[PDB]
Design a protein around this ligand. Structure first.
Ligand SMILES: NS(=O)(=O)c1ccc(S(=O)(=O)Nc2cccc3c(Cl)c[nH]c23)cc1
Lengths: 73, 806, 426, 81
């Protein structure tokens, strides 16, 4: 049948309930208010070179390396 | 002008839901994106255990969990609407909970226009890269490698300039993107291999395939099956090289599939959510081969039942599914093997409050006077409701009145002790000729009912969805629908007002309508209808034919002020009980919003910012006083005071423009200088003068003057109060000093987040104070309250005096 | 299948998604006839309406007064009019373009706006051919080998307020820069989207060089300076109120030429020039694989391929007609043949340095027309630009205004303000 | 001028300035008429180029008719009015 649904832990939702008719505006998660500063391993940076300029530069380097094939086959 | 913007109710709509092992390798987490807020939960025996709420300085546009090689547990990638990108790690040293910013940086390009189907962020199954679709004709690649101190992102030109959806495929040697694109020939599917070495696209593993015209979603089926599922309006298709399967189930044709969820890790079962709220199960029939490989034998869809209209579906565990909703309440549902008496396999376990979208609201002293209560028009379609909100001593208290149809406008009539609510219901035409209601609603279950017997417009399609507009008369105590007045066939009720006009001692319900015929897409005719609700019965008093759509209506010194398309028109109420045109203003584009204060009128245009009109009682005509010459697409307007006006714009910013005080010439007096700019991050639909706090009855000189409540699409309720130049200068230095101590997840500068931003300009925040950052001072530790430099160390005299509102 | 406006407006309230891009398939909200918003009707001068400003506040127009004095010298004026939906247009600025200029033939003039810099507009004007040094009864007669280019930068009316320092009307940013140069065959292409991709800068192709011209105004705040150049020619000049020859003026006549030390409002005129022949020779000498075979070059044609305002890089293509010895292979005598090629060069506006991006192979002309060669080379540039096309943000585009009503190309039908969905029907 | 030419089957992004750049090398142009769609503000993919000398126009027609521009084969022919 359509049901033989994933079980990550049989205990999950086995003791669940709040038992109320269509109502729960509970913002139970405590807000995270950071004070401690921890360094970053990396900084995400965008490549400044234009896509056309990048392509024309590498395509010319492909053509040049193909010409440096000299002194036999 | 100087203002204080504070949150009374945080956004309640669910914009995105994701699962994984973020807090621990063994913990099964549920991560909810509520606009700017990230809610972390652990799935336990009791249900969802709350962890922490992360307040990002940005609208969460991309939220995906991923695990690179060697990593202890999953990492979270977040991309904001302002293009701030970050990789986050959860750290817990016993009791101390901390979120580490692994990598941060802005990925915005000066070139490139944002795409129609908005920011898409995908992560490669082998975690070789992150792929971003922000702009048309560009694909951003973020290589994932811990070895280098920088993550050097690069753009690859995408020939297909109109991409609908994109996914990274599983079981691939090189990272591979599968996408649906539109062009004059229609919609098609395409694949490309991503080369990190060459920084380009290589020929796709499988050729271009012509897909359905309304093909909207791409599903990447995991490693066993491989390939991609495409969902359209009329069909579901599977694609993996020469392998192809297409199904046309007539059931899915009725409503658009908008979300999907992989149930099985192998990809055998998928949950599919409808615009109607219907829940489906997509079944992928397995085909085990002698080679050790697996293929797809068949595709089958089964209707499971009904849920809230889902934005995101998320299987959690043991048949329990999270239904993330933005047009209604969110839910926890149970998938049972056995179906009930109705024939449904789905059973609701819990309901979570969502006030959004708030389309209209009003402030009323319902139960006891002086204590204000908000009465909103919430949700849409079957999720449509009224929400009664109040600051209840013994924080916020919400009462839900389900309507099972779209609430549009709300007004209160104290003399009648009731609410006048505009509602719309969807009706589908059958083989009978007449349209039938899908489900019972507030307009069909009313105690007494009436139909519009108007003959003014003296001179349909099967399956086509039509809107049936009604004026509902709702009791203020029971919230029962006392009366339902059905407007004309194809008539749309747009505006609503409750007032006394001229010398008439009777209070009326006035409705501005528009005729919406299937033949023409433009509103060329409407009506202004005057109704009176007496001892149980509602009667039609008068009707005035207009040459367009009645967008807004405001009572104006005993007269009826209405906006008909591009015209702003003033009406008088004659002794013959008829409406007579006094004056007109024609210099508008789409006059959608109107507000009044004395002889002054604030005109909000949908495309051409805001305009100030003054009615001259001696001349009996309008005068254009000033204009905000700045280009703004407006969502809502408000009059703060005689010379200051508040505006809400389409790029989720707030602005305040004022009459020029240093203006010498008549031309300079006609210019409204913008003196207040702030990035709210919410789309404001309604502004209201009011408070949820008791009048006075024991009160002290407030640091702020005025009180403007506002309702947004995300269900967020906020306050705008005007501050003194002395209070502003104090809190401005405080705001900047608090930013040096209060850290930011993803290393996004607060000043950047709050800056006025549009596709045309980016200017810093001015004349506005972020009330949520100022109020966070009460939650930090005593040794970290060191933001004060000349004495008065106990700054709890202020801040706590500021929390007194809301 | 077009949807009802009211269904779309209903969708905005529940989605929070409102944009001009979303409403692009919607018809104009308001259409005004020019006749109903124009004053002094019946035959109100020679006003050729060009269109709306990017901000949608001004409607621009121009006049071409021939002046039948037999000899006939053209006078050009540019007008700014305030638009107010159904109300009549109000003139806010009347300016004279190319002062003291002997315009012998009717110029094709185009008014352009910068991507984000709204403080000034640029007016390009060109004749079909240059006026000769002769006369043939009926008219002056043209020079088939030359063409004149007139370039004028005019300040836009202030949005209102400040600099009440009148001292009698006239103001502070009521400046005018105007220049004139001659071009030879193959007459350089007009590329306003690229020539103005960088704010406050105009790139000019004078057949022999590419001139980057930056015009900027500064107050006596030492916070900002030099956009062009943080070796080939660079000239910086200063001007206060009260190589391409540029004569500055106020809204009517000449300002005082000043040097650095001046404390008050000052204008800067910068010119970075790139010599084509020096570039061509330097590319052949250092990067062309066939540089040994090269003898000389007959002619060249420069087309801009891309302008990157963030990295201050200008990508240009150089179409080259040259004479070269054929490959060392002996099939008889090796007489030099005429070949066509193309060199791609990236010019850094910050350093002034140029870098070789691509060197094309030598293609034999084989008795082709010079015109056939340039036409084919320019089709190859259009092909490249179209192929690498990436749509841009609105309000970053170059507003190009034209109305060739007098140039046998006939008058415009509609002047549109797309962001406000407003049409002026002529 | 002796010869008016119909230029058709153009890509909608091709501007009047591009058409001038592509046809001008053959000789003097009296007028260019790129046809614009009033409702969109974009090209109709066709126009009229009038040369001052018929021989310049005939050579332009020979070298440009049937050949691709932005992947679209250009259509060039003689036209009266
Ligand atoms: N719509 S577009 O393709 O993005 C586009 C459209 C116009 C421009 S232009 O204004 O810079 N002109 C332009 C560019 C390239 C070649 C030529 C020739 Cl030859 C004459 N004018 C050219 C750039 C890009």
């Amino acid at each position: 049948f359509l049901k033989g649904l994933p079980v990550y832990n049989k205990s999950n939702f086995s003791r669940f309930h709040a038992d109320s008719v269509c109502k729960a505006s509970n913002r139970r998660p405590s807000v995270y208010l950071p004070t401690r500063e921890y360094p970053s391993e990396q900084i995400i940076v965008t490549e400044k070179t234009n896509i056309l300029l990048r392509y024309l530069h590498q395509q010319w380097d492909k053509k040049n390396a193909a010409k440096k094939r000299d002194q036999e086959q | 002008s100087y203002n204080y913007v504070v949150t009374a109710q945080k956004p309640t709509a669910v914009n995105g839901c994701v699962t994984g092992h973020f807090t621990s390798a063994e913990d099964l987490n549920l991560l909810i994106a509520k606009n700017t807020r990230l809610e972390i939960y652990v799935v336990t025996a009791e249900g969802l255990r709350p962890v922490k709420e992360v307040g990002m300085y940005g609208k969460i546009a991309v939220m995906e969990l991923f695990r690179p090689k060697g990593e202890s547990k999953d990492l979270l990638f977040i991309l904001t609407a302002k293009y701030n990108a970050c990789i986050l790690e959860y750290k817990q040293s016993g009791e101390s909970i901390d979120i580490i910013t692994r990598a941060h940086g802005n990925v915005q390009d000066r070139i490139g226009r944002p795409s129609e189907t908005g920011i898409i962020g995908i992560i490669d199954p082998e975690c070789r890269m992150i792929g971003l679709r922000l702009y048309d004709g560009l694909f951003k690649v973020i290589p994932l490698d811990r070895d280098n101190k920088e993550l050097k992102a690069f753009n690859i030109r995408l020939e297909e300039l109109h991409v609908i959806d994109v996914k990274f495929l599983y079981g691939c040697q090189a990272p591979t993107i599968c996408f649906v694109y539109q062009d004059p020939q229609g919609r098609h599917v395409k694949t490309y291999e991503v080369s990190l070495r060459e920084k380009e696209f290589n020929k796709g593993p499988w050729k271009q395939e012509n897909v359905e015209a309304e093909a909207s979603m791409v599903i990447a089926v995991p490693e066993p099956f491989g390939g991609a599922i495409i969902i359209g309006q009329e069909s579901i298709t599977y694609h993996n090289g020469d392998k192809y399967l297409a199904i046309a189930p007539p059931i899915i044709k009725q409503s658009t599939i908008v979300c999907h969820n992989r149930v099985d890790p192998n990809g055998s079962r998928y949950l599919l959510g409808d615009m109607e709220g219907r829940l489906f199960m997509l079944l992928l029939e397995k085909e085990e081969q002698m080679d050790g490989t697996v293929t797809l034998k068949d595709l089958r869809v089964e209707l499971l039942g009904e849920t809230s209209i889902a934005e995101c579906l998320t299987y959690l565990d043991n048949g329990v599914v999270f239904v993330g909703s933005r047009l209604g309440d969110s839910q926890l549902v149970k998938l049972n093997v056995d179906s009930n008496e109705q024939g449904s396999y789905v059973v609701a376990m819990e309901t979570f409050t969502n006030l959004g979208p708030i389309v209209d609201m009003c402030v009323v002293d319902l139960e006891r006077q002086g204590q204000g209560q908000l009465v909103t028009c919430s949700g849409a379609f079957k999720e449509g409701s009224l929400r009664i909100i109040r600051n209840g001593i013994g924080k916020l208290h919400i009462r839900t009145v389900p309507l099972y149809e779209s609430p549009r406008k709300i007004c209160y009539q104290e003399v009648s002790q009731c609410f006048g609510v505009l509602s719309s219901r969807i009706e589908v035409q059958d083989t009978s000729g007449g349209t039938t209601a899908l489900r019972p609603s507030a307009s069909t279950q009313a105690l007494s009912s009436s139909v519009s017997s108007s003959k003014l417009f003296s001179s349909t399609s099967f399956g086509e969805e039509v809107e049936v507009h009604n004026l509902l008369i709702i009791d203020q105590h029971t919230f029962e629908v006392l009366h339902a007045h059905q407007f004309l066939q194809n008539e749309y009720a747009l505006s609503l007002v409750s007032c006394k006009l001229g010398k008439d001692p009777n209070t009326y319900f006035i409705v501005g309508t528009a005729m919406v015929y299937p033949e023409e897409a433009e509103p060329k005719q409407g009506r202004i209808v005057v109704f009176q609700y007496s001892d149980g019965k509602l009667q039609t008093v008068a009707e005035k034919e207009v040459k367009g759509a009645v967008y807004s209506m405001v009572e104006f010194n005993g007269k009826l002020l209405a906006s008909i398309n591009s015209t702003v028109r003033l009406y008088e109420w004659t002794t013959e009980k008829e409406l007579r045109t006094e004056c007109n203003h024609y210099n508008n584009i789409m006059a959608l919003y109107l507000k009044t204060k004395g002889d002054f009128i604030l005109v909000g245009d949908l495309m051409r910012s805001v305009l100030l009109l003054a009615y001259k009682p001696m001349e009996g005509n309008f005068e254009e006083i000033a204009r905000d010459f700045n280009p703004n697409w407006m969502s809502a307007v408000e009059i703060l005071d005689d010379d200051n006006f508040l505006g809400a714009e389409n790029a989720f910013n707030l602005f305040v423009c004022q009459k020029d005080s240093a203006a010498t010439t008549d031309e300079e007096r006609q210019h409204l200088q913008e003196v207040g700019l702030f990035h709210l991050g919410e789309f404001v639909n309604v502004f209201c003068h009011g408070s949820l706090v008791m009048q006075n009855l024991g009160e002290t000189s407030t640091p702020t003057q005025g009180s403007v409540l506002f309702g947004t699409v995300n269900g967020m309720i906020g306050l705008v109060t005007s501050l003194s130049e002395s209070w502003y200068n104090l809190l401005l230095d405080m705001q900047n000093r608090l930013n040096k101590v209060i850290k930011s997840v993803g290393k996004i500068e607060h000043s950047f987040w709050r800056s006025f931003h549009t596709e045309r300009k980016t200017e810093p925040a001015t004349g506005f104070i972020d009330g949520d950052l100022i109020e966070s001072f009460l939650d930090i530790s005593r040794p970290k309250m060191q933001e004060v430099v000349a004495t008065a160390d106990d700054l709890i005299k202020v801040v706590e005096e500021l929390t007194r509102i809301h | 299948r077009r949807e009802h406006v009211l269904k779309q407006l209903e969708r905005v309230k529940i989605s929070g998604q409102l944009s001009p891009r979303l409403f692009r398939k919607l018809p104009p909200r308001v259409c005004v006839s020019l006749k109903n918003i124009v004053d002094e009707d019946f035959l109100y001068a020679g006003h050729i309406f060009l269109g709306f400003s990017k901000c949608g506040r001004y409607v621009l127009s121009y006049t071409s007064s021939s002046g039948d004095d037999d000899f006939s010298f053209y006078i050009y004026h540019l007008y700014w009019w305030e638009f107010n939906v159904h109300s009549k247009l109000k003139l806010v600025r009347q300016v004279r373009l190319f002062q003291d200029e002997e315009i012998y033939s009717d110029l094709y003039l185009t008014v352009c706006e910068w991507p984000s810099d709204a403080s000034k507009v640029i007016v390009f004007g060109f004749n079909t051919r240059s006026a000769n040094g002769m006369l043939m009864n009926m008219m002056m007669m043209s020079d088939e080998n030359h063409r004149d280019i007139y370039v004028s930068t005019v300040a836009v009316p202030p949005p209102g307020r400040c600099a009440a320092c009148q001292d009698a009307q006239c103001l502070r940013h009521g400046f005018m820069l105007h220049t004139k140069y001659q071009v030879v065959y193959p007459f350089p292409t007009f590329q306003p989207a690229f020539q103005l991709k960088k704010d406050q800068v105009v790139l000019l192709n004078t057949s022999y060089s590419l001139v980057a011209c930056a015009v900027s105004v500064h107050s006596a705040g030492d916070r900002s300076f030099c956009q062009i150049l943080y070796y080939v020619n660079y000239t910086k000049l200063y001007y206060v109120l009260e190589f391409v020859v540029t004569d500055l003026r106020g809204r009517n006549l000449r300002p005082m030429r000043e040097r650095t030390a001046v404390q008050g409002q000052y204008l800067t005129v910068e010119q970075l020039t790139l010599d084509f022949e020096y570039v061509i020779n330097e590319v052949i000498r250092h990067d062309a694989t066939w540089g040994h075979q090269f003898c000389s070059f007959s002619d060249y044609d420069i087309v801009i391929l891309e302008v990157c305002p963030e990295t201050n890089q200008v990508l240009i293509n150089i179409g080259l007609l040259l004479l070269a010895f054929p490959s060392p292979t002996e099939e008889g005598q090796l007489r030099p043949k005429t070949y066509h090629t193309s060199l791609k060069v990236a010019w850094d506006l910050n350093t002034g340095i140029f870098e070789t991006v691509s060197v094309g192979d030598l293609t034999e002309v084989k008795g082709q027309t010079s015109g056939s060669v340039w036409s084919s080379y320019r089709k190859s540039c259009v092909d490249m630009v179209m192929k690498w096309l990436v749509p841009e943000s609105s309000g970053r585009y170059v507003n190009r205004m034209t109305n060739e009503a007098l140039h046998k190309g006939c008058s415009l039908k509609v002047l549109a303000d797309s962001e406000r969905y407003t049409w002026i029907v002529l | 001028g002796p010869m008016r030419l119909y230029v058709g089957s153009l890509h909608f992004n091709i501007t009047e300035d591009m058409l001038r750049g592509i046809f001008e090398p053959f000789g003097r142009i009296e007028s260019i008429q790129l046809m614009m769609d009033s409702e969109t503000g974009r090209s109709k993919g066709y126009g009229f180029i009038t040369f001052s000398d018929s021989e310049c126009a005939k050579k332009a027609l020979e070298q440009l008719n049937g050949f691709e521009l932005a992947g679209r084969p250009m259509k060039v022919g003689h036209v009266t009015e």
